Structure formats: structure tokens, C-alpha cells
Amino acid sequence: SPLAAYEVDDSTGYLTSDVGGPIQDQTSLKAGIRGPTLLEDFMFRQKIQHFDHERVPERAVHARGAGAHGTFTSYADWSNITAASFLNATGKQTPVFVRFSTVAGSRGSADTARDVHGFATRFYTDEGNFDIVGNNIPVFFIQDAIQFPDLIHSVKPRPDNEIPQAATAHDSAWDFFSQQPSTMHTLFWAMSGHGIPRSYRHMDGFGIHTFRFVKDDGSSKLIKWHFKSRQGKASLVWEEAQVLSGKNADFHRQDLWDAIESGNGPEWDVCVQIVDESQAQAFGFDLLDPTKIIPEEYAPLTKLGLLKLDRNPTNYFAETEQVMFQPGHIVRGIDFTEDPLLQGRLFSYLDTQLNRNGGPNFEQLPINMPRVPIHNNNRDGAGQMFIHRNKYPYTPNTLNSGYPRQANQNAGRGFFTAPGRTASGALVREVSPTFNDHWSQPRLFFNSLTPVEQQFLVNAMRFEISLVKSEEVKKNVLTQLNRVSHDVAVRVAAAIGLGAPDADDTYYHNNKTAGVSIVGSGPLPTIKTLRVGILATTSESSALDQAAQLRTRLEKDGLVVTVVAETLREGVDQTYSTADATGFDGVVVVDGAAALFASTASSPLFPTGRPLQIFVDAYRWGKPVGVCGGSEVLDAADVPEDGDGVYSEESVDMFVEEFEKGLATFRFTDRFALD
Amino acid sequence: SPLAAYEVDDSTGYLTSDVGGPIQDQTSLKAGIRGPTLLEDFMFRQKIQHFDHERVPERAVHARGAGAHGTFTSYADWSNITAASFLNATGKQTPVFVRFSTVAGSRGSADTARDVHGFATRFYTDEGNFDIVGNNIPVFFIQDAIQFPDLIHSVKPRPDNEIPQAATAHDSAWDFFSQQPSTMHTLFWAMSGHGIPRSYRHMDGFGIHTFRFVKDDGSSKLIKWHFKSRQGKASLVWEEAQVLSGKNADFHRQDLWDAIESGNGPEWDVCVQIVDESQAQAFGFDLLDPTKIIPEEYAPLTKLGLLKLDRNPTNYFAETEQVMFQPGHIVRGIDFTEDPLLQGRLFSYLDTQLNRNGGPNFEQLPINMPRVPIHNNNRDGAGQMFIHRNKYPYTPNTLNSGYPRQANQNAGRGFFTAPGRTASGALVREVSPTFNDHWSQPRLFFNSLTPVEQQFLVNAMRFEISLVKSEEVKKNVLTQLNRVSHDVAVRVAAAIGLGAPDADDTYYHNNKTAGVSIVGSGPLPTIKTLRVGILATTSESSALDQAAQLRTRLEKDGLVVTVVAETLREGVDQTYSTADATGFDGVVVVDGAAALFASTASSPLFPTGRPLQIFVDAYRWGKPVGVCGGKSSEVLDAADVPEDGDGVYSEESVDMFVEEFEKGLATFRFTDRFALDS
Amino acid sequence: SPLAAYEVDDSTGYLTSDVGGPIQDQTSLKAGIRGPTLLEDFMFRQKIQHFDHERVPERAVHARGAGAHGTFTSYADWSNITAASFLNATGKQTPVFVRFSTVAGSRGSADTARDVHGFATRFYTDEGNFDIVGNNIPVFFIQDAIQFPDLIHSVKPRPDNEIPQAATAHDSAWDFFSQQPSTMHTLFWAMSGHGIPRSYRHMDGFGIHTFRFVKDDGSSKLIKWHFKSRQGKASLVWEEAQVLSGKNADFHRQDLWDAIESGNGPEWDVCVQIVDESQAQAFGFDLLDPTKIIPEEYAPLTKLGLLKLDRNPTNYFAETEQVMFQPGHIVRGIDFTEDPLLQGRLFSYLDTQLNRNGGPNFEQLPINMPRVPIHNNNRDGAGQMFIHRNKYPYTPNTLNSGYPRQANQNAGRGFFTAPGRTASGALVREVSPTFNDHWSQPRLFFNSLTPV
Ligand code: HDD
Ligand code: HDD
Ligand code: HDD
Ligand SMILES: [Ca+2]
Ligand SMILES: [Ca+2]
Ligand SMILES: [Ca+2]
Ligand SMILES: [Ca+2]
Ligand SMILES: [Ca+2]
Ligand SMILES: [Ca+2]
Ligand SMILES: [Ca+2]
Ligand SMILES: [Ca+2]
After folding, report:
1. Ligand 10 ion: Cβ-proximal residues, 5 Å cutoff
2. Which residues are involved in binding heme (chain C) (predicted)?
């Protein structure tokens, strides 16, 4: 509603100033036709002042990201576990807006950097805006919010030269990770495929912190939020991610945009783990510690409702850039915990909007407005867009008949702090000793990945640590990695020419947990939206016919098909010059195009070797690949015909049926070497 | 209200955050009943953050002021002199918002400082917002906008100690005035009663600069804007103004507010002088020079329409504080001239809103919004409220079919610069010699005042210049004033114990012009809203009766009546403790209260001598005063007021008393009570 | 460093607040060891408030870039052609700071996008800061500054979805180019290897506009600035640039930084073409039109001096992010022309610094300060760092003895507008017909390239 009221249509009409005076804006007013521009040209100055002031500070973290509208629908009346109004009835719908992001990069940095990712969700509830400001990884680097600028200074570019962009592959970051062992768990997640998701739709969301569900009788339970993807879990490989950062920095935002435009809006089951207050230390670690997960073997997930994103913004700046999330946007039926990471966040997100917005009335921007009436005695401030009719904005008053009325647990559906909560003890700047195991869970996570996934994680660390210049930092990194796993430390040390420290088995173990592996999570549950590149030629009308035949068969099943040839024409979407294997989830060469794949093939229309390099890159990166028409191509690529995920069929139908199974498998991991 | 779409009502409902979450706001969340406050108390921090951020920079000038909504109505179809849409039909109405102000004082300074006054009018026209950003004085201190910081630094407080507030009565101001002779004309105005108007309703507004009216055929004429009060012109006296500043700093804003609430919303005829382009230098001065008026004897006023203010704001900060006027808010049919003061203003008022608002989307505030659609390619910026559908905001485009289309003289009702305008010559930083007579028009104004009015102007200068510490500066002041009038320099010099310099008659003359004198502008055309204090007593039930009878008779005629007595009760509005002569336009004592006027009278309920002081001050400041009931000698003798004085009334009959007293309210001030230099 | 006065050393000492109280910053203050954080924890709040407020708006264009300090050295006394003090003696040295950039991308976008590039140079002269705010391409896309938002909207990402980053390869850009044919000359330059230079050191810098040199006697000549690389000209190839954008988004800034650190600081000869006022239309186009070059065959380069960059910044944000260039930073001896693109720039760069800095005292930032005294009556404003002793900051005054004195052509080495300049005619919003050939110069350029 606040959005619809502020939509501005410029599909017709004459140009006006911001005060509705019709004007022009194409030629400056000058003293003669070859003369100096005049100060009295208000048309020039208003247009250029606006331009000059377009930009606002980027977000201090998560500067790079993209958003969409949708709806949350409750599966049930959840009154038995929370008073939350948005959860109080089967089928109850609440509008949402979600923004997804990286963490370290500035605006304009690439989507496919290796990083932690944001997953921030606003529920415009009938009892106020409720935000769950989460990440795609369920644990955080640090245990106390006061350390956030340390973490973030260390990962962001070195501040003398501002190098490197959007990367932890520098001395300072690994200096911090090695000195602050709490970082191990999130580190291991970021060095897995969770640091390079295939799309925002193929990752989960996590609140990280323990929160409370509070009932209308005052009782509480402890919860963790999990948003579980209905699209499946999928990652890129690092070598692919690096090329994609160059070829399409906008890959995740375009994937989102496109999925929504085609009627394939992504979905998640909004879930919780729910445990009793008495179980704060029962699972072998402290539920106040944001570097720990509750293994699902100890507390299963309950599905609360469906999150669907199905509408793109109208103006990115107004909606996506200006959305201002806060964990302080809480509603009756939810409460905080004493997680010292959460506790400090509550301060930060209120304060930082003053930086972004430049003034205190940021909740008035349409994307930040609620969908219920606002009744309070907040007044004035720069940018004040309301005209308040209550001329006695103080409590207690008689002159406004004691309105607005105080809301609390007893009346008015007020927020209230869970009334069972207490504090006791000295006023301290001390870390709880219950937070001191920094290594067991990183090992739990590592144990739960498949062998090739473990290899990819090792290889990520090998990559990044080999770029650390400091020999001491690199030694200190091995010291910490060795506390998680001696084998990781040895394997990583081998790439950097150092020896690993001797095994220290204090935290070693062989326990695993379900639901953290990407490679182990089975085939994708849908292939709709996945991209197939068909490599063809204009030389041979046979090639274009085969391509068209595959197109119809793949499109029917919701795949996005790109036919690539030397030059554009009817049925060809993309020239070889602009094509890359990073643009596809699977690649098919029509056998009529075989000539383009020869070592001597050359054209002024694309770079030498491009058609073959698309095919070979796709294969090396694990993708389903094949040749359709029943040979030259598989041999030019040194691609084995018997390999899993390599397809070779004369029959278009048999080809598509086999090829679509391989898109669901998504990645053929047998093509990656192990230690 | 014209801003009803933006109104928020809080007459019902439970307290919420700004995101609609019901909350409380009266107790902090604490770790135990006697414990420390918690960081997780979001209720506390959202509330206090908002409080901590309430303030915005005051305006760089005109910080002290007040506003109201109203309606402009055209008297005619003016399409034969201007294309301006708001003037294009008889009876055509346009919403307005007006803010009045002083100039030098900060927020919270007193309304009744001696100063220039602003009068800034927004017309929310059907072809865009059009602002006339004027003053109550028709001429400006300086002739080029680049000098404005110099002027304003010199008048504003000295920057080491920030003293004095809201006053030109200090060395720096008079240094600048004496060094920059352009200032003489506005200085003479500010030192007249125009520097201390009775109210905003009793002053005129002027655009100061020559502008252009431009027809749809592209022809132009030169115009001056003159908003002429239908309430009459009136001033305070200085001795009164000084007290009033202390007793009621809000006097002008309260007067306006009250007049609108009572259904007596003030009115002005919006008028122009209209002259041809060929007359730019025909009147003996340059029409580009903002230190000159065109005498009404050379060019008469044409009444274009009625401005009436009739609705107070709902939220002062949102509407009055935030209104951001600009002379760059111009409409088709009006154009600029090459007046160097005007030319630079155009820059300043767009820039300065960035300071006030903190971001570039200030035209989106409700009070600044137009009442017609906006179609342009301005985008983003902090605080962006709009959600623009056009995703191709560049010209020229095909992907948005070429919209928005360019508007100009021939299409779309565009603004256009008057096509007859030209420029010639070297690119220069020099002053036109046509601007060099700084002294003839100040003398024209002074010549046009009555003798008591001229004494008041001399006394204002005596007062201020006596507070200048520097003997140098004071001599330089006398040097400049002497160029306007030797008699002024002599009479000022006498108070400060210097000799005036020898006469220099270069610019002396005896010409006069109509319409600049307050004292000479004849009785007020209406007495509605004027204030009558009735001084009574609770000791005599007959004095209360007398007061009640006078109340009924005066209220019939639209006077604001206050009955004063020792204590409040039914029919008594104010105590002597809170009353003052600055609160009234006339003072009546009921003769049943004579005992309160004796030298010996004392009470713990009010300061010694308060009833009599009210009467004596009112008399000494020129107001109509009297005693009603027939026994007048005890009160008049205590006050040293002669029963036969002009504007002194004594009648037993309430009806006759009121008939006579009302004539005196229209006369307004009895100027025979002020001494003149021989 | 030239900014040594403002440096802060933290190689020793105990952690303090901003007001010098020693503190800690690693654990929050809590009501109990597993308790909630306390509002009275000022250590936490001061630290996190600073963090929360670290960012400032990126530049509206040229957001992605990097800078270095160096020195300019005059080859001669140029008194013959300009009163500019920095050019008045052989060997005269002036400190400089230079920032290089792309145009369209935001912060964090890749260095090796295909784009126009900035080359902005500040000379911290003994008669005031003088900036030449240039590009590596000598011509601009448009002929009137009022059009800049249109160009820039069209080349920046589409505003519904903010796609694509740092690229002209989208409908809106090519729509604008094809509807505004002025854009052809720059477009051909940007689609050449000049759009993907090998490094900032392997590109030239151009002022683009005609400016004036003005002598002390008031006479003037028309000039174009050229900064000619002593490293040579080199480009990437486009396939290579695309991969490099992914592998190393920081390639140009690293190349620069490393060159300086190794003692290979890059050099340019600072040159001008110098023609008479009477030649404004003599070359077959109008010297007021920023979409045209003067062919070197018509006016040769004169070498004025040497630009060498040889010192990297100490704090990128303080120095590089904060440097606020302006074409209005001009000195006696130089003047503007009536190029309608230049004319409107003069407004933009003073105004935009209010957005970036959030207040009016941005010339007080160390990187923006001049290296000579400041004497004026500018006062107050948010962030005011000066404590002004003159309590009579108005002119004309007696109470401060008439100081500061006015400076002009004849007194105090004032800036002055070239006194031969004039204007004639109607006040118009019309384009000179002398600007109308959008296509010959693009062809000239294309013809000058080799076959490959
Ligand atoms: C003490 C400070 C602090 C700490 C410990 C954290 N953050 Fe945060 N976060 C910020 C301070 C902050 C911020 C500076 O306040 C940001 C920048 C922009 C904004 O609105 O808030 C932000 C932004 C931000 C966003 C981007 C929201 C958007 O798309 O606009 C996400 C998703 C997260 N954070 C998620 C997290 C998670 C899951 C954390 C740990 C569980 C976390 N942050 C800890
Ligand atoms: C070069 C600068 C400059 C000059 C020469 C003037 N002013 Fe001005 N004026 C401003 C710069 C300014 C300003 C700094 O831009 C203000 C402060 C607040 C605002 O909106 O504009 C302003 C405010 C302001 C206001 C207050 C409007 C309101 O109520 O909000 C009035 C009535 C005037 N001025 C009137 C005048 C008149 C009649 C002038 C001469 C004919 C004049 N000003 C010259
Ligand atoms: C009407 C506005 C306008 C126009 C026509 C131009 N520019 Fe500009 N330019 C700006 C408005 C602007 C700006 C918005 O004012 C920027 C953003 C940051 C800043 O300081 O100024 C800017 C920044 C900017 C920078 C970055 C400086 C730095 O590194 O901090 C360079 C190098 C240029 N521009 C170069 C040019 C050249 C060579 C132009 C044409 C010859 C040009 N600009 C036309
Ligand atoms: Ca580093
Ligand atoms: Ca993986
Ligand atoms: Ca003084
Ligand atoms: Ca008077
Ligand atoms: Ca025009
Ligand atoms: Ca586009
Ligand atoms: Ca600000
Ligand atoms: Ca000059």
C-alpha cells in the first residue's frame, strides 16, 4: 500500500520541475549562442543538483545485494508455541521483502566472490514489521558484537591501498582468523561450496542466534530459524566462480530477477528448531554461542510456513537500496536471548540508518513503512513526511485524553520481554567459559562433507593461504587448522611448502550431522530455470535444425535455452563472442557444428578456440555436457564418451531424457582429483 | 486542509513503534528493579534517537518567523499582460502558504526586534509552485548578491561572543552601513516604524526586484510586486517594542494565529507596477537597482487579486519550519531581470535547502509538493519517497517513447526566458555607474514622513548609534547620514556628543512620495481584532459589573477584550500579575476600581504599582486610554494624564464611552504625546 | 609525506577512546557472565557507532579509482604565455596528487571494465590549488553539461534491477548513443583499446576542453592539455580484460601501487596545444565543442614540464576516497572558455562535495587543503576546524583595518577573467550550428587506427 501510493508514472506528459512547472532539460541558457552559461538557469541547476546528490553511503557490510517482494503463508495456528500474530492461523498471508547479499565487497563487486551471504527477510505483519536478518551460513565468525569492526576491517581491503576487493585471500583476514579461533566454524563453511552458491535460490537462510518464542501466557521456548530451500542446494566451483565474476558480476541478481519474471519465484519452508529453556547447555555447548549449531539429530525442524518471492522491484534504488533492516524490528511473541553477538547488533542497525538515510525519518520511506497505523510521539527531524494532528505528544497527558495508550503484556497486544528472563552476577567484561570450544564443531562440519567436498574445501584454503605473504601468519593459520583436523593442516601445508604441526587431538572426533553437505544433498528437486547452452553454427542448416529441435524439447520442461552461433539470426540468441561456459548449467553441441571444434578453426567473429573452450570449461567444471546427432567432438575435447554426465545420442528424445537427469545431478564430481 | 493526505491522527489507539509494533515508552528495561538499563531496550533507543535528532538547522536568515495557509483569488483575466496561469481568469483561486519573519535573530528571538521583515508567499498554481519571496520594506541594503554574507555577518552577533541577539545596535553593523552607502535606503526604512510593525497583518509585502511579465506572444513588461494590507499600516513605538520583546516574544505569531482562529484572517491586495522595457532608466535611476523604488506618482499600482490567510498549520515544524521558498520557483509568464541581487539569490535558495533538509529530496516534503503531476528524470538521493516506473530516465530516448517530452514556448506550456532579452559587452566584475546614487532616495523617503515620524527615525538612530563603542565608526556614520540630510546628521550627532560634518547638498532635495508613511496613512480601516484591556477589581462587585457591560459592547464590534483583576474568576481573563500595557491597543479603567490606582496601594498578588503602571505605559506609548463610569479624576490624576488630552476618554455612559474610544482605536496612536527636537 | 602533520601513529600505546581515555574493546559489558549487554557500555557504543558510520557516498561518476602523490617540475619560465605561478621558472617543483578511475562502475567494480577513464591531477601551487580534471580520451560524449544525467543514466545499470554493472553493453546505453549522435567520437575511442588500457601508467590524460592561458598583461591564448605517458601506450585485449575483471578486479590500482613501491613511479610530459583566439573556428570545427580534437598536424604539442607519481597514500580512505577535485580550482594565469560542457561542470563539482562530505568544510580535509595561507570571511558550517581570530568577517570594514584585501588583476595576484572576453546576443537555450558535425572526427579517428 505505501508503495502503490508513491508510484510515479512517466509514460506520458511533458517534463516538469519537481514543483510541477513544465520545463526543458537539454540545452543550457547562455548569453549568446556561443556564450557562457547563466546562473539564472534554474532548469540546469535543479537537474544537476539532483544528479550530484544521487548517491548515498553503501551499507557498511552487505553492500552488494538484491531484493524481491513476496508473501509468507502460515501452515497452521501456532498459538501453542508463540503469540506472534503472523503465525496465528492456517493460511494467513503476510507480505514480505527479502534482500540477499555478499558481505565484504562494495557496491559493484561481483556476486560470485567467495563470501558469507546475507538473507534478510521483512514480514510486514499486522502487528508491525518483523525482520529476520540472517545469513546462508548458520554460524558467525565471532562471539561478541564488539568484535565486528575487527572482523570486518580484517576481511575488507587493506586500508593503505584498498586491495583486495571482495576477498578473504589476503594477509589481514587470515591474521585475524588465526588469532581469533572462534572464526573456525564459519571459516570452514565459507571455504566450502556454501561460500560460492549457485544462486540465491539454491541456498538456505539462518537466523544464526537462538531467539525465543513467547506465548500469550508468558512462557517461552528457545528457537533457531532455518529457511530451507525448495529449489535444492547447489554451488559453483571456484575456478568457475572466478571467471563468472568477470564475465557477469550480476549473475545472482539476474538469476533471481529472471526466475521471478518467468513465474518460477523461489520458495523456502520457514522452519524452527524448538527446545526448552532448560536445554541451554544440554547439547554440549551453550545456546547463547553464535558459533554453534544445534545438530538436527538433537532437535528436528518444524515447518511453520511458506516463503515465496514473486515480484521484482519497480525502482531498485528506492526499494532494494533503501530497505533498512533491523533485528530491533520485533513483534509480540518473539524475544531476544543473551547471545552477546545478537545483543550488540540491536544497537548497530538502528544507528547505521542515520548514516545511510542522513536523517532520522528513515522508517517513513515507503519500503520501510508498516502496513498498520503508527501511533507515537516521535516528532520532527529532517525529512519529516507526516503532519501530526496530536498537539500534546507527551505521556502522561490529559490534553490528548491519555492517547496514545501504553501497550504491554496485559493489554494493547504490546511487545513484552519474556517474563521468565533474569540476570544475576557481577557486571563483567568477561567471556563465558562455556564459549571456549572453538574447534569441535568445525570438525563436525568437515566430517559431514563428502570426500570431493572436503577436497574442495582444502583447495579453497590452499588457494587463499598461498596468497598470504607473511610466513608467520601462514604458520599461525596451520596451528589453528590443525586443532580442527590434522589432515586438513597437512594437506593445506603441502601447497604452501610448510610442514604441519604435530597432531593435537584435544578436539578431534568422527561425528557427523545431516543437512550441511551440498554435494551429498541428492539431485535437485526441480530443473526449471536451469540454463542450457546449445552450440551450433550458421554454416549448416542441419545444425540450426538440430538446435531448434532440442530447444523445443528443453523449453517445454522449463529450461532456459540459449542457441549460440557465429552470428545472430532467427533462433540464435547469442554469438560465440559473448558466450561463456559460466553462462550455462549444461552444454550441448549439435553434431552439425563439429567443424567449429577443430584446432585450426578461426573467425574474426569470435576469439580463437571459443567454441571448444565453452565445451571443455563446462566439462572441467563438472557440468552435464554432450553431443546430439550420433565422435569428432568428444575427442577434440578429450572428453570420454563413457564418463558420468557425458551424453552422446543420435536420438534427440533419448538425449534430452538423459541430459535432464544430469541437470538434476547438477555436478559430476568424479572429474575432480583427490589427495 | 490542502495537506490532509499527509495527516496522522493520534486521538485513538495504542502506542506503536514507527513500524507499527505496539509498545510502551515510560519505563526502561533493566537487569533487576534497581539495575542497569539494557542495550536490548529497542523501545528506549528508537524513542530517544528520534528525540536526539529532532532539530534541523535554522534558516541562515529569517530564522524567526511564522506561517499560515490561505487562498489567492484573481480579480481578472490577466492574459493580456502575462501568461501566468494563476492570473488567467476572473475569480480563479490558487492555494497559498505565507511565512512572515524577522531577518537577523535566531530561532526563539523576539518578534518585536527592530529589523527588516520577511513576507514569503507560495502560490500552489496549476502550472507549478510560484514563490514571491519578499520583505516588508521595498528596497534592499545591497546591490549585488555576492555581498550578502558581508551584510549578514555585520548585523548578526559579533562572532567571538555571539552578542547582540536580533539587533543592529552594535559596532559591526554600523561599520558596514557607513562603509557601504548602498545601505542608506533600507536603513532609513528599518529605523522608521517599518522596523517595528504592529503585526504581520499591518505591514505590506514587496518583491523588491524588478521582474518581467511575459505574454504568450513573448513580449514583456517590467513589474514590481506590492502586497498592500487591507488592515492598514501600523507600528509599535520603540520603548514599547523593547518591553514587548520580554513580556511576549511570540507577539506577532500569536496575533496572526488568533486573527485566523477568530475568522479575521488577514488580507492583502496583490498589486503590480507595470512599465515598459524602454523605461528601465527613464525614472532617474536604474530599474535593475534593488535599492530604488518607483514612486507611485510615476507608475500607479494595478490590483491583480486578493490574498487571504485563513487557516493555521496543524504541525508547526512540518509546515512552517520546513517550508523551503525559492525565487527559482517561477512559472510560465514571469521572468527574471538582470538585477545582480536577484540573479545570485537564484543560486542560494536552491543550495541552502540541502543544508536544512540534509538531502536533495526537499521538494517532496508535503508543504513543498506541487498540486500537479511531476514528470522528470530526477532520481535517487537520500530520502527518495517516489517509486518511479519509468526505467529509461534519459533524454533522448526511444525505450520510453520519448517521454517526458520537452516543454518550451511552443509546446507543453513550458517556461521560457523572455525572448527579447539580450546581453552585450565584456565579461566584467564591475558595478554599473547607473547604481551610484545611494542618497537621493533615502532623502525622498525621509521627506515623506510626518514630523513626529521623522523624530521617531532620528530617535531610533540616536538609540543605536549611541551603543556603537568606536568613535571612528560613529564619525563615519555621521558622514553618510549627512549625505542624505544634514538635519538628520545634526540631530543624531547631538545624542552622541559629536559634531556633524558640514552640509553636502549634492543629493539634497525636497521631493516626496505617497504611500511610505505609517503616521500619515490615516486611521485604520478596521478595528476588528484590536485589544482592549479593562482594568477592574474583585473588591467591588460594581467594578465587575462595569467591566461586563463594557465587554459586551466592545465585543459586539469585534474587539478582543481582556478584563484584568487581582485574581481570576468568571468574567476576569487575566490577573494584574500577568498583565502589561504591551498586551493592549487601548486601556480602560472602570471607575469602581479607582482605589487600585493610589500610590499607597499594595498586594502580594501583583507587583507594587502594577495597575497604575499599565495605564501610564499605555498613555505614554500613545494609546487610547480612559476611565468609564463618570468618576475619572482619582485615576487620571494618579497617572498625570490630562482629562482634556486627545485620546483620553471620560464618560459615565458605556455607550458614549465606547463610541469615542473606538475612534481612538482607529486613530491608533496619539502622536501629540511625543516631544520634538526644536 | 606532504600530509605528515595529520598522521596518527599506532605502532605503540594502549587503546584509547577518541577523547584519550584508555579502554578495552574486545568484550561487551554484561549483567552477569551469560547476561545481557549494558547500555552504559560506552566502549562498545563509541566503537560500533564509528563502524556504523564509516561509509560515505561514492562519487556520482568515477566511483572506482585509485591515487598517488608526486611532483610536477616545470621545464621553463612560461611567463611568455601564462601568469600561472607553478609554471614561472625552470625547475620549479609543485606537489601533486593524482586519481585515476573508470566512469560507470560503482565502488568494487572491476578496473578492467571497458570504459572511459579519469585522470585527475591536483597541483598544490604556491598561488592555490589548481586541478585538471581529465580523461584518457580527448573528447567527450556530449556537448552540453545539462545532458550529463541523461548520458550517465543511460550507461549506468537499468534502474529497475541495477543490471549491468560497469558496462555500456545494454539497450539503454546504445539507445542514447544512437539518438544523440554527438556521442560517436567518444564511442569510437571507448570501443578501441583506449577503453581497456593496460594500466593507468600506459594511458594519456586530456583536459578535453579548450581553456585559456592568460598573461599578466591580460592577453590570452586558447589551449588544450595533454599529459603524454612516458611509459608508452598499451591496451589489453577484450577476452583478456573479461577474465582479468574476475581474477583481479584491482589490477590497475595494484599495478600503480607496485610501480611506485619499486621505484618505477610513472611519468608524463605535461603538454599543451597553444593557438590564437582568432583560431576558434579556423580548423574546420569550433574549439568550444568538446567532441573535437585539434589534429596534431594543425597544432603541435608544447612540453611544459614533468609529472611524476612516486609516493603511495598512507590511508586510502583519507587520501584517495576523500580527494574532492574541481575545475573551479583555478589559478591566476588560466581561464575558462564558453564550452557549454565546461561551463556546467563548474557548478557540479562544488555542489557534489556537499553530498560526499555531508557538510561545507570539505576543503579542510588534509588532502584538500592548500599549501599556502587562507584569508577569507567564510565561517561556521558543520565540521568547522578553524578557530578564526578576525571577529569582523565582512567587507568593507574598518574594524579589521580593511583586511582581507581584495585581489584582482592589479593587486594581490588575484585571479581575473581574461579581459578580452565578451558576450553578445539573445539569451538562448539553443545549440550552435557550428557543433553539428558529429561524424567526420569519429571517421578521422577510425582511419588512424591500424587494420587489426
Ligand atoms: C555489531 C554490528 C554487527 C554485527 C555483530 C552483525 N552485523 Fe549485520 N549489519 C550490521 C552490523 C552488524 C550493520 C552495520 O548495522 C548493517 C549494515 C547495513 C545495515 O542496515 O545494517 C548490517 C547488515 C547486515 C545484512 C544486510 C541487510 C540488508 O540486506 O540490507 C545482513 C543480512 C546481516 N547484517 C546479517 C548479519 C548476521 C546474520 C549476523 C550475525 C548473526 C550479523 N549480521 C552481525
Ligand atoms: C545571496 C543570498 C541572498 C540574498 C541576496 C537574499 N537572500 Fe533571502 N535568503 C537567502 C539568501 C539570500 C537564503 C540563505 O537562501 C535563505 C535562508 C533560508 C532560505 O530558504 O533561503 C533566505 C531566506 C529569506 C526569507 C525567508 C523565507 C522563509 O520564510 O522561509 C525571505 C523572506 C528572504 N530571504 C527575502 C529576501 C529578499 C526580499 C531579498 C532581497 C530582495 C533577499 N532575501 C536577498
Ligand atoms: C554536469 C556535470 C558533469 C559533467 C558535464 C562532467 N562531469 Fe566529471 N564529475 C562530475 C560532474 C560532471 C561530478 C558529479 O561533479 C563528479 C563526481 C565526483 C566529483 O568530485 O565530481 C565528477 C567526477 C569526475 C572525475 C573523477 C575525479 C576524481 O578522481 O575524484 C573525473 C576524472 C571527471 N569527472 C572528468 C570529467 C571530464 C573529463 C568531463 C568532460 C570533459 C566531465 N568530467 C564532465
Ligand atoms: Ca592484507
Ligand atoms: Ca561444493
Ligand atoms: Ca559588533
Ligand atoms: Ca511610527
Ligand atoms: Ca528559453
Ligand atoms: Ca538497459
Ligand atoms: Ca547529513
Ligand atoms: Ca575579473
Report:
1. A 358; B 358; C 358
2. 349
Q: Which ligand is nearest to the CA of B332?
A: 8
Binding residues of C for heme: 349
Nearest to B376 among A16, A315, A405 (CB): A16
User: Which residues pair with residue A94 across a beta bridge?
Assistant: A72
Domain ranges of chain B: 1-427, 428-526, 527-678
Q: Check B377 against C179: CB less than 8 A apart.
A: no
CA–CA dist A78, A146 (Å, integer): 35
- Radius of gyration (C-alpha) of chain A in whole angstroms: 28
Ligand nearest to the CA of C409: 11
Pairing between strand C220-229 and C205-206?
antiparallel
CA C241/CA B86 separation, integer angstroms: 59
Give the mutation target among A349, A350, A362 for probing the ligand 1 site: most ligand atoms within 8 A of CB. Answer: A349
Q: Name the fold adopted by C1-427.
A: Catalase HpII,  Chain A, domain 1 (2.40.180)
Cα(A112)–Cα(A235) distance, rounded to whole angstroms? 10
Helix (H) or strand (E) holding A302: strand A302-311
The secondary element (H helix, E strand) that includes residue C47 is helix C42-52
Note the CATH architecture for domain A527-675.
Answer: 3-Layer(aba) Sandwich (3.40)
CA distance readout (Å), B462 to A37, B105, B195, B444, C66? 47, 22, 15, 21, 63
* Residue list, CB under 5 A from ion ligand 7: B 193, 235, 518
Q: How far is CA A558 from the centre of its chain?
A: 24
Q: How far apart are CA A20 and CA C178, in angstroms?
A: 30
With CB atoms and an 8 Å threshold, state whether A50 touches B364.
Answer: no
Pick the residue of B183, B394, B400, B416 with the most C CBs within 10 A to test the interface with C by mutation.
Answer: B394
The CA distance from B418 to A59, in Å, is 47
The strands making up C422-428's β-sheet, listed across from edge to edge, are A30-31, C422-428, B422-426
Of the candidates C176, C419, C429, which has its C-beta nearest B426's C-beta?
Answer: C419
How big is the CA angle at B308 (ends B307 and B313), to the nearest 5 degrees?
120
Does A412 contact B14 at a Cβ distance shorter than 8 Å?
yes
> What's the rounded Cα separation, in Å, for the pair A479 and C133?
51
User: Which residue in C69, C129, C135, C226 is the catalytic one?
Assistant: C135
> Domain A428-526 falls in which CATH fold?
Hemocyanin, N-terminal domain (1.20.1370)
Q: Crossing angle, helix C148-155 and helix A42-52, to 10 degrees?
A: 30
Q: In units of Å, what resolution does this entry have?
A: 1.4
Report the structure determination method.
X-ray
| CB of B135 closer than 6 angstroms to any ligand 2 atom | yes
The DSSP symbol for A59 reads: P
Which is nearest to C2 in space by CA: C398, C213, C314?
C314
Contact by Cβ (8 Å): B337, B361: no
What is the Cα–Cα distance from A360 to A349, expressed in whole angstroms?
A: 13
Determine if residue B148 is labeled as part of a ligand binding site: yes
Closest C-alpha among C341, C226, C336 to residue C291: C341
Q: Exposed (0-12), middle (13-18) or buried (19+): which is A659, by Cβ within 10 Å?
A: buried
Q: Which atom of ligand 3 is nearest to the CA of C101?
A: 29
Report the 10 Å Cβ neighbour count for A537.
25
Residue C358 is which amino acid? G
Type of residue numbered C374: I
Residue A442, preceding bond cis, omega within 30 degrees?
A: no
One-letter amino acid at B221 equals: K
Q: Specify whether C62 is catalytic.
A: yes
Distance (Å, rounded) from C-alpha A128 to C-alpha B236? 55
- Tell whether ligand 2 has an atom less than 6 A from the beta carbon of residue B341: yes
Q: What residues form DSSP beta bridges with A332? A: none
Let me know: does A332 contact B16? Beta carbons within 8 Å.
no
- B527-678 domain in CATH 3.40.50.880? yes
Q: Which atom of ligand 2 is least distant from the CA of B145?
A: 5
